[PDB]
């Protein structure tokens, strides 16, 4: 029924004046004298409720309904396939007004295959001819891939309804509708559930409800397991893991549940267990790096927490002062200074979806597939907004368009430039680029709308290295007073963040050599001491020999 499908208020508004009206109020069109050749097409992400909606609407309109499944058209003969189609468009005309639902039209509208499309397209013209023009016949087609349709058919479907993905207000309606016949607690905040399910569709929200129901029965399974244990005194307790025993215990009886209700804590657990269909492929795991792993870089942190982390958490607070919820940032500086570190901290501290591109990872040897990967990269970034796109070592993906560029990477630079233009100010996509050679990256990528924000990550100062060395040593376990002396030592003049990490590793290795000799003069716990830092400072040199090169770009 209509009550069972929610969150489609915009879609149900168009279907009222484009499907319902020329099926029940055709007399007004007859008085107006206007033929209805509108072919209504339903398209959107898979799982948005196209098939279910088209059957709930069909049952509500009340006119004759002819469900058509594309695989069921084929009967076993080349000529029999047209017989099934010719028995549909004739029946609808004979029983006008009528509704035709061509579910999964692209399965037979992408020999026998080339003749079904011709029969389908001719059958729509007969609808316009063999009708009183006051009893319209509407053909409704649903497909999640509108681009696979034959242009001879998609041209005949003037009305196209893009359901799209539900918004926060719409997802709240779906969640309330799904949890309508269930027993619920009082802590369930459906508005909070809608906030933390971005990129979800109706099917994904159905899994979240389904996941929470299983959690509500977890307590009813442990009690069932305990009864089996009490019946078998110490059975299969050796050489069998606990999960294996649980299957064996429940397999024994197979012959012999209190009605509890779902709480709010189980709904939060359910959301984590459910991976939305938009995130099944193409998304990277959230990095384990936090802001506690990033030492100093307060200036870079403030810019990142005000352009990316900020707008994601409070999209309304920032938009009041003219801060749009979308940014393009080009981190640049000498190598080893933390461009990738802060980008991994932003991806983890923003709680948003993350896509990482490792240099020229999108290039493909076939024609067009290299550019389609770039376009598909921004297609799934929009569907899972907010999303952070991190282009690491971006100088290899958008090189300077010199004479020595070939007509293969230029076609990718142009595609990437256009996709960055298509990213709106309120889209929710935050693109981060990192490169240590800004003189090899195209100057067209730094225009506004594109990566027009540049953040320079450079070598730490003497006071800055103290924060970084304390950060590195803290996350691996000398105290803290000695760390200031080590980092402020003049031998660390050009040390970057990586060099300080190399310095700590050298001290750790120097400890083990001392430990190895320590255990030979006693036999015959390793702790990094201050004397280990003394010989680590001597044998570690800065990696960035000429820092001026990396900042003169």
């Amino acid at each position: 029924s209509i009550l069972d499908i929610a969150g489609v208020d915009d879609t149900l508004q168009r279907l009222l004046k484009e499907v319902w009206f020329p099926l029940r109020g055709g007399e007004a069109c007859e008085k107006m004298g206007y033929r209805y050749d509108n072919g209504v097409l339903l398209h959107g992400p898979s799982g948005c409720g196209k098939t279910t909606l088209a059957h709930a609407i069909a049952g509500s309109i009340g006119v004759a309904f002819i469900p058509v499944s594309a695989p069921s058209v084929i009967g076993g003969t080349s000529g029999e396939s047209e017989k099934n189609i010719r028995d549909v468009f004739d029946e609808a005309i004979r029983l006008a007004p009528c509704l035709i639902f061509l579910d999964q039209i692209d399965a037979i509208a992408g020999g026998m295959e080339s003749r079904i499309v011709a029969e389908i397209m001719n059958g729509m013209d007969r609808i316009r001819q063999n009708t009183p023009l006051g009893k319209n016949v509407v053909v409704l087609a649903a497909t999640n891939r509108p681009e696979f349709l034959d242009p001879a058919i998609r041209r005949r479907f003037s009305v196209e309804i893009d359901m799209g993905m539900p918004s926060e207000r719409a997802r709240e309606q779906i969640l309330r509708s799904l949890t309508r016949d269930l027993s619920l607690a009082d802590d369930i905040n459906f508005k909070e559930l809608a906030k933390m399910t971005p990129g979800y569709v109706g099917s994904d929200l159905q899994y979240v409800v389904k996941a929470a129901v299983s959690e509500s029965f977890q307590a009813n399974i442990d009690s069932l397991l305990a009864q089996a244990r009490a019946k078998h005194p110490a059975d299969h307790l050796a050489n069998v893991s606990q999960p294996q025993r649980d299957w064996l215990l429940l397999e024994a009886h197979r012959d012999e549940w209190p009605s509890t209700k779902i709480t709010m804590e189980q709904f939060r657990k359910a959301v984590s267990l459910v991976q939305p269909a938009s995130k099944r492929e193409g998304f990277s795991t959230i990095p384990d790096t936090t802001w506690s792993h990033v030492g100093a870089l307060e200036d870079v942190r403030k810019k990142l927490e005000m352009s990316i982390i900020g707008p994601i958490k409070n999209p309304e607070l920032f938009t009041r002062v003219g801060i749009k919820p979308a940014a393009g940032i080009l981190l640049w500086g000498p190598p080893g200074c933390g461009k990738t570190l802060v980008a991994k901290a932003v991806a983890n501290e923003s709680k948003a979806n993350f896509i990482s591109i490792k240099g020229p990872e999108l290039l493909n040897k076939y024609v067009g597939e290299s550019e389609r990967a770039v376009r598909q990269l921004f297609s799934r970034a929009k569907s899972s907004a907010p999303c952070i796109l991190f282009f690491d070592q971006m100088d290899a993906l958008v090189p300077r368009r010199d004479d020595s560029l070939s007509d293969a990477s230029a076609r990718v630079v142009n595609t990437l430039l256009t996709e960055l233009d298509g990213v709106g100010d309120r889209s929710g996509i935050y693109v981060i680029g990192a490169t240590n050679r800004p003189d090899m990256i195209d100057e067209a990528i730094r225009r506004p709308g594109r990566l027009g924000t540049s953040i320079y990550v450079g070598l730490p100062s003497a006071e800055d290295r103290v924060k970084i060395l304390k950060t590195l040593y803290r996350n691996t376990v000398t105290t803290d007073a000695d760390l200031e002396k080590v980092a402020l030592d003049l031998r660390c003049t050009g040390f970057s963040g990586a060099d300080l990490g190399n310095l700590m590793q050298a001290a750790a290795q120097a400890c083990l050599e001392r430990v190895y000799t320590q255990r030979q003069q006693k036999r015959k716990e390793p702790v990094i001491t201050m004397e280990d830092w003394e010989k680590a400072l001597n044998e570690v040199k800065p990696s960035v020999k000429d820092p001026e090169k990396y900042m003169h770009s």
């Binding site: 076993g76 003969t77 076939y366 020595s404 070939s406 293969a408």
Partner: peptide, 24 residues
């Protein structure tokens, strides 16, 4: 009718990299 497995063609059209030479 019997459905048959048929052999067909493809477009492919791979793109290859090249090496150039420069003057002094």
């Amino acid at each position: 009718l019997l459905l048959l497995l048929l052999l067909l063609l493809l477009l492919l059209l791979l793109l290859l990299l090249l090496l150039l030479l420069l003057l002094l």
